[PDB]
Each structure stands twice: as C-alpha cells, then as structure tokens.
C-alpha cells in the first residue's frame, strides 16, 4: 500500500506502508537454489510502477498542488484565498514560510540520515540491481528485502519533491515581499498626498 | 574351482599374483617372506589346495577369512605377539564384500589409503556390505544412509535428500577412492541417487576426512566401491515388484574374456519404474556399467571402465510436499498422498563416469596405481509445485515455476605409492600421492516466465494439472572453473608391539575462476595425528586429531568484501574397539568433539544499514562445536547369526551456546539382523530391524500470523522385517516388509515453511535367478 499525502503532515509525502515482521533474522537458511527469487522479482516489478507513477504525477503538477496546499492552510486560519490587504499579505507570508520551514525540517530529516547503499542519491538508479544481488545472496524471503526497498525509494521520492516544494515557496514568498514592499510605499506616498 | 598359472619366484611375489588369480585378498608380513621362494602351481585346482601346492618348502601357514586369508611364519620359539604388524595386501581397495556372508568388513582404505582393519583404523568407520543390500533391499544410496548407523536422511523435495552426521551436512563423495567434486546442496546432480547395482560396499567414514578427499565438509565422506571383473564366470538376473507399482530389474555378468584369463570382463544393467504413495509421481531409472581388466604381464595390470545413470520423475514436488499453514496461519491437515508438483514438473539428474587406471608391483613391495576418470554430473528441471501460504479460504491455490539446468564436467589425475619401511629394525608403512582435478560448471536459471496463468481453483483434491509455462531466456548463468591441486603422505610406525601411531597430512591448492572475481588458495595444510594401542588380544584403545576445510563461495564475503576464511573443523576422537572371532563380529565405542571455525552467519548490523557499494549482502565468521557419543556392533552373533547395529548420541551448539541442526535427532538408535537357519531349514532365511530416533524440531516462520512457531517430530520407531527361501541351487524368492507398524512421520520438517512424509508400509516381492 503507497499513499500519496498531498496535505501537510509529519508523514512523508509519499509513504509505503508494511506488515511487521519477527523474521528479520533467521538462524539458518537452506543452501541451495531460492524458490523467492522469480516472485521476489514479480512483487518488486509491481510495487516499483505504482511508487515511480505516483512520484511523476506529482512532478508534472507540483505547482498546483503546493499552492493548493498553501490555499488549504489560507482557508484553514480563516483567510481568504485571494489577498489584497497589508494584514491579509503578511499573514499569507508567514503560512508560506512555515509550510517552506516544516519541509525544510522533513527534507533536513531524511538527509541528515546516517550514510549507506539506502540513503545514497543514485539509489533510485540502484535499487532493482541491489535487490536482486540481496535475494540472489541470501536466498531467503524477499518481503524483509522489498519493504525496505519501497520505504527507502518513498523517502528518495519525498526528498526530490520536498526540495522542489522550497523552491516554489521561496519564489512564493519573495512575490509577497514584493506585494508587501509596494503596498506600504503605495500607502506612505498616498497618506503624505492626503496632507 | 579356478585355473592357477604361478611359476616359482620370490615368495611375495608369489602371494600377490595368487591373489590376482584367486580373487581373494593376501595378507603377509614383508619381514616374514624376505628370502623365501614360491614352489610352481599350474592347472585347475581349488584356492585352497592352490596355497599349499604354493607354500611347499615355506614353512607359512594360512588363515582362511572368507573373501581373505593371512599368511604367518611360525617359529620354534614362541613368536611376540604385534597383531597391528605391517602387512603387504593384495586389493588396494580392501576386501570384498560380495559372497561374504557377513554384515561386517574385512580390511579397508578408506581412511588414510593403507590397507587397515576397522581395529587399525584409528577413526570412526561404518561399512554397508554386500549382504545387507542384498538381504534389506536397499536398492539405492538413499535406502543405505537410512540404514547407516550415525546417519539421519532429511529431505527437502521427492528428488532432493541430504544426509547428516555429527551435526553436519555430508557434501562427501568418492567413488573407488577417487573424490567427486563438492557437491551443491541445493542442485542436485546425481550423487544422492545412485544406485547399487554396480557396487559391491558403501564405505562411510565419520568426522573430519580431509587427508583423501581435500576441500570438502564435516561429518563424513561417503566412498562406494564398484563391482570388480573376475576370474572365474558368475552372474545372476533379479526381478522384483512393490507398492505402488514399483518394478525392478538388475543383471549383472562377470567372468574371464579369453582362454588364459588375462582379459577380463563384468557388465551390468539395471532398471527401475516406480510410482508412490504419493500423487502424480513416476520415476524412471536406468544403470549401465562395463569395465575390464588386462594382465599386461604377472605386475601390471590396465583397467578401462565407464558408468552411466539416468533419474527422470515426473511430478515432483518442490518446497516440501505440502505448505505448513494456509493463507490464515492456521497448520494445514493433509494426506500422506498430497504432492504438491504439477505433472510435468521433474528434477531430471544424471550421471557418467568414464575411467581408466594402472597398477603396478614393484620388487620392494610397493606397488604403485595412477587413476584418470571424466565425470559428468547433470540436472534438467522445469519445476513447477503449489507455493506459498495456501489455501487460500475458497480452497484457491498460486503455483511456483522455475528452471534450473546445469552440468558440471571433471577431468582427474590421481598417482600414488604406498610401501613397506624399516626403521630401528621395525617395519612400518607410507603413502606418497598426488592428485589434480579440473571442473567447470555450467548452468542457466529460468525465473522471468512468458505470460503465465499460474493459479488452481482447487487445493485439496489437486491432481497436478497445471499447463507448463514459457520459460522465457535465462535470468542468471553459471559459468565456473575448478582446479584443485593435492599432496598427500602418510606414515604408520610401528612403535611397539602394541602402539601403532599415524601422522601425515594433506598440502591443498584451490581455484575458481569464472562470471565472479577469481578465488586463490594456495598452500592449504591438512593434519592427520592418531594412534592405537593394543590393551590384549580382543581389545584397543585409539585417539584421533584430523582436519578438513571448504573454500566457501564468492557470495560469502564480509563487509570489506573480502572473502571469508574457509569453513573448517577439527575431529577430537577417544575410542576403544573389540575384534571376535578371528575379525568375523567386530565392536566399538567413540567420544567425538567436532570444532568448527568460519560458519558462515549473516551480519545483521551491516546488512541492515549497508555502506560499501562492493557487498550488498555480508557475512561473518563464526565457531561451533558437536560433542557426542557412538557405539557399534557389526558382524556374526552366532554361527549364522548376523548383525548391524549402532547408537548415536550429538549436541551441536554455536559461539553463543544456542543449539543448531536441531531437526537432526541427538539420540538414533539401529539394529538390522537376520538369521539364517540349519538342517532342514537350511534354505529359509529370516530378517528384521528397528530404527529409533529421538525428538527433532525446527523453528518455522508464520508469515500469515507474523510469528515464528517450533514445529516438532516427537520420537519415533521404524520397524522392518524379511525372509528369502532358496527354492533352487538357482532360483531364490524374497519377501520385505518396510514400515512394519505404519508410522505416519516427516522427512522435512520446516524447510521451505513445508513439510514431508516418510514412505508408509510398504512391500517388494523379489526373484533371484544365478547362472
């Protein structure tokens, strides 16, 4: 199961949700062929569209879908979602920035993970290699292998949009400054005029 | 009655070339025929007037001990008494078995390559005769190791048996001493389904055996030793038939190819139909063996040969025979009947040997023997069996479909001298060998399957009717080659009268080169420490330090990729042993400690959190240890009055004090006896067994209910019984009865979170008719 969240939460964008397993560590493993290998296979093929598919409908749209995140929290603290005013600007700002800081923090957690093969920027691009060489290696049951797999690729694909996101509320939020700027000096020149 | 042809010569001479003529094995001490000579015999005269035409003039007496005899000069004085005297033999490979009578052996070299009785043998050594085959109907090396005392037969599938012993796996085979290269243990190729038409004995030697087999595993290597030509005519045709439309047929000719009898000849044919108690299952067997034997002059003698066996079932099954729970978790409750295998699924194993060898007499006594052999050790599986947590709750069910075909060719080369030497005016005896083998192993797997439908509607009254599927192109190929190089030498000093001590050792050269990076190892040292001293007449203590080590695979590296140190062990043996009845009933009694370094474990902590781009997947070393104990008893009781019988108690623990190979019993029991009967009875003969063993369990993964459970196998006995009556001189009928009581048991207990049945009751009905 992968579920796309496209509202703000502490969950990762894109998340894979597993069963728990007590088989993470087996004392003894039959030598010989392993009968998991082709469905090991099978099940990855299955699970690595839907998480690929998942993460590019979200590039393709990530415009959108961020501003209508931003239009959710607007709406959420009784704003409206067209803003005008020099208190409604300012407020807007601030929900901007504290969106553009929660992901900071979230895109900051993942990167901030101890190094290995998981963590690594070319693991998208080394997944089904190394998943394979893992089966192939410890001839054992792939679904320990598969979770991890799906997991890791789910905060892969959480990083690239997260870091992308910043991008939109940074430009976001200098518009607002822009608006703000203007807006107090359309108001200043107006109020000396009034005199 | 035979045709002897000796002129007079030097007395030893004499004795290895009656040997060769007689087709019985000469014992006698090279000191004790020094300068004596051989009076002439010519012409057809029985082995025993032949030996005392021969010794004329030698003052020697003979001991006749059936399929051997020893020769002794006696003195005016009363001779001192060394019963462990090195002694000059006739047959390389020890005395045969056939027509023996007996249950135990004569001499064998299966150990350190010299001629030695079991008492002389300072190691843990079982042998199954001729007539225990014979008379128990162990048609196959299966049914053997299911009666080998020491010996726990586990299966993973129909096709795929793996023996244990001193809480290891037995990856060790020799086929005339010669060793097969170590054998995979999940792809069979052939060696666990060889059939004994064409040996005579399976020698089964326990511990760490590295001295002659090189690179190998613990616990035992199994040599079976081919049927030989002969001097004199014999054959016989046996056809049988049992449950479950099982067929048998087996001929077997021997005997001289010209008038002088320097060309000899044995040829046999076996072959085998079975169905079983289980559903849509049929295997088909054919054996096919022919060698000969050329007398180039009275010392050297050519031997060519070739061997082929060919194992083609058609259902069998994969994981087990049946999965341990069903989609819920809940433990599935199945028939003995139940296969899980679709009908076309086979795990199709073949084998050929092609052989040739040359045996030379030197002046000195030594004789010399160079050994050329071409293997070939195949499979061709299109498998295909119900897998997985099934059934699902509307009695559903998905099959599992891979193929695996693989053959793997050997080229070997073995040379070796073995001879009499005096020291501090004492004889003792060495052994001096080279050997070099060449392997490669080729194989494809098929796991990437063309548009496949591969679900059953129903589970419990499956028939193995799924259509086959379209392999598609190989997803993995194996491409590997073998060169392992070997120096062996041993000495046996005869200290005392009554200490004998062994120390030789084993340098080993090995690489693998192939798809994989190249595995170097050279100068590889294997020790052979042992000793046996002779408390009286009947009684001997011996104590034993041997070695063995594998070259693991490319797969096994740590988390510096570097590969690990090779899996290996040390055999720690204290024992006494007993010989009655001039060597005809033989007792022993053993404590082993088995020490093991470099058990391959996985490493959690890297492979959770793995950081070199090299190694995906890590190991680590880690150090076990078998404690154990084994009585035995093989041989005459009474007059005819035979037995085969043994215990064996083990405890195998790792660096954690964690017990391991649990489904591997720590107490087996095993008595095979049978009787033959005197006077008017003289024709019948009587038979029966019993086989015990303790509690075995394994701890299995409920992936439904997301918990591991112990699945167990309480103790259970096995009861065996037979009887053969002698209607002709020629024609002779049997009867056996296996699983007298109808046990319902397992073979496989959790491998694959599956399990499997032992055969239930069963009979074979045979007929027995000798030319």
């Known amino acids: ?195 | 009655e035979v045709e002897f042809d000796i002129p007079p010569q030097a007395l030893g001479s004499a004795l290895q070339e009656f040997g060769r003529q007689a087709d019985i094995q000469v014992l006698y001490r090279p000191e004790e025929v020094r300068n004596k000579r051989s009076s002439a015999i010519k012409g057809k005269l029985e082995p025993n007037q032949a030996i005392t035409e021969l010794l004329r003039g030698t003052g020697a007496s003979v001991d006749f001990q059936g399929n051997a005899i020893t020769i002794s000069v006696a003195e005016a004085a009363d001779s001192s008494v060394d019963l462990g005297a090195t002694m000059i033999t006739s047959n390389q490979l020890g005395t045969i078995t056939e027509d023996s009578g007996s249950y135990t052996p004569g001499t064998i070299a299966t150990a350190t390559r010299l001629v030695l009785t079991p008492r002389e043998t300072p190691q843990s050594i079982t042998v199954v005769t001729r007539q225990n085959m014979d008379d128990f109907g162990l048609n196959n090396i299966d049914d053997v190791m299911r009666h080998t005392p020491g010996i726990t037969v586990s299966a993973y599938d129909t096709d795929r048996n793996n023996y244990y012993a001193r809480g290891f796996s037995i990856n060790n085979f020799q086929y005339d001493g010669i060793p097969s290269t170590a054998r995979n243990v999940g792809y069979s190729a052939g060696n666990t389904l060889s059939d004994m038409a064409i040996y005579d004995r399976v020698e089964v030697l326990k511990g760490a055996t590295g001295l002659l087999t090189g690179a190998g595993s613990l616990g035992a290597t199994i040599n079976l030793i081919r049927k030989k030509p002969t001097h004199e005519f014999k054959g016989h045709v046996e056809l049988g038939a049992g449950s479950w439309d099982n067929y048998r047929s087996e001929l077997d000719v021997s005997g001289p190819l010209t008038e002088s009898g320097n060309v000899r000849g044995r040829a046999v044919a076996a072959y085998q139909d079975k169905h079983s108690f289980m559903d849509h299952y049929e295997r088909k067997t054919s054996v096919y063996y022919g060698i000969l034997e050329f007398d180039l002059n009275p010392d050297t003698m050519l031997t060519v040969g070739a061997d082929y066996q060919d194992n083609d079932p058609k259902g069998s099954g994969w994981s087990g025979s049946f999965p341990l729970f069903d989609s819920q978790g809940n433990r599935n409750d199945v028939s003995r009947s139940f296969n899980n295998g679709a009908k076309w699924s086979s795990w199709e194993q073949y084998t050929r040997t092609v052989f040739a060898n040359l045996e030379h007499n030197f002046a000195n006594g030594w004789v010399g023997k160079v050994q050329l052999d071409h293997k070939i050790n195949g499979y061709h599986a299109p498998l295909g069996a119900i897998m997985g947590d099934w059934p699902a709750p509307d009695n559903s069910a998905k099959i599992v479909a891979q193929k695996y075909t693989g053959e793997t060719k050997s080229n070997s080369l073995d040379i070796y001298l073995t001879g009499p030497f005096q020291f501090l005016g004492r004889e003792h005896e060495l052994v001096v060998g080279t050997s070099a083998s060449f392997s490669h192993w080729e194989g494809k797997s098929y796991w990437n399957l063309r548009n496949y439908d591969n679900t059953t509607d129903d589970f419990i009254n499956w028939d193995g009717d799924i259509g086959k599927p379209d392999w598609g192109t190989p997803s993995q190929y194996i491409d590997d080659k073998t060169r392992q190089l070997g120096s062996y030498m041993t000495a046996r000093f005869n200290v005392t009268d009554d200490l004998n001590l062994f120390l030789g050792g084993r340098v080993v050269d090995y690489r693998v080169t192939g798809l994989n990076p190249t595995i170097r190892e050279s100068g590889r040292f294997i020790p052979y420490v042992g000793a046996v001293y002779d408390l009286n007449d009947t009684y001997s203590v011996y104590a034993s330090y041997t070695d063995i080590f594998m070259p693991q695979d490319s797969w096994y590296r740590d988390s510096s990729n570097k590969l690990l140190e090779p899996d290996e062990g040390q055999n720690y043996e204290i024992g006494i042993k007993g010989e009655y009845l001039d060597g005809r009933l033989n007792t022993s009694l053993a404590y082993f400690e088995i020490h093991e370094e470099n058990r391959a474990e996985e490493d959690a902590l890297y492979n959770s959190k793995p950081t070199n781009p090299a190694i995906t997947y890590a190991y680590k070393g880690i150090k076990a240890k078998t404690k154990g104990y084994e009585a035995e008893i093989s041989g005459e009781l009474a007059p005819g009055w035979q037995v085969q019988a043994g215990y064996t108690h083990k405890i195998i623990r790792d660096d954690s004090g964690k017990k391991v190979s649990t489904w591997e019993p720590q107490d087996q029991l095993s008595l095979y006896t049978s009787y033959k009967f005197k006077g008017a009875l003289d024709k019948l003969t009587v038979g029966g067994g019993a086989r015990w063993q303790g509690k075995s369990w394994q701890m299995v993964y409920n992936n439904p209910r997301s918990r591991w459970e112990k699945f167990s196998q309480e103790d259970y006995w096995l009861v065996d019984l037979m009887a053969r009556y002698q209607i002709t001189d020629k024609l002779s009928a049997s009867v056996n009865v296996n699983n007298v009581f109808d046990k319902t048991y397992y073979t496989n207990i959790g491998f694959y979170t599956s399990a499997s049945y032992g055969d239930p009751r069963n009979l074979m009905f045979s007929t027995r008719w000798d030319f």
């Open chain 1, 1 to 195: 199961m992968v579920i796309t969240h496209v509202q703000g939460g502490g969950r990762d964008i894109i998340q894979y949700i597993p069963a728990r397993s007590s088989y993470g560590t087996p004392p003894f493993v039959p030598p010989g062929p392993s009968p998991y290998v082709g469905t090991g296979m099978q099940e990855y093929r299955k699970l690595r569209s839907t998480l690929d598919k998942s993460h590019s409908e979200l590039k393709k749209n990530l415009k959108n879908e961020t501003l209508k995140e931003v239009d959710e929290l607007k709406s959420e603290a009784g704003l409206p979602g067209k803003a005008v005013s020099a208190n409604d600007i300012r407020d807007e700002k601030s929900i901007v920035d504290a969106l553009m800081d929660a992901k900071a923090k979230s895109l900051k957690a993942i990167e901030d993970r101890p190094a290995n093969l998981y963590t690594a920027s070319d693991f998208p691009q080394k997944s089904e290699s190394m998943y394979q060489s893992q089966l192939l290696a410890s001839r054992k049951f792939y679904g320990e292998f598969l979770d991890r797999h799906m997991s890791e690729l789910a905060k892969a694909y959480s990083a690239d949009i997260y870091k992308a996101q910043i991008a939109i509320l940074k430009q976001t939020s200098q518009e607002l400054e822009n608006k703000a700027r203007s807006l107090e000096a359309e108001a200043q020149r107006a109020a000396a005029e009034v005199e």
